[PDB]
Amino acid sequence: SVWIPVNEGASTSGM
């Protein structure tokens, strides 16, 4: 089941 909202904890890598 897919529940966690889009982008939670998302970012660029910084690379």
Partner 1 sequence: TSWRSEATFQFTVERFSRLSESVLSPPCFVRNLPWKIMVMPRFYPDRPHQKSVGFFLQCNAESDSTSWSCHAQAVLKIINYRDDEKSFSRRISHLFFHKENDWGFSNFMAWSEVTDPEKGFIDDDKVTFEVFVQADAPHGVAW
Which residues of this chain interact with partner 1, rule CB under 8 A?
Answer: 2, 4-15
CB 8, min distance to partner 1, A: 7
CA–CA separation, 7 vs 15, rounded Å?
Answer: 19
CB 6, min distance to partner 1, A: 5
CA–CA separation, 14 vs 5, rounded Å?
Answer: 22
The vertex-5 CA angle with 11 and 1, nearest 5°, equals 125
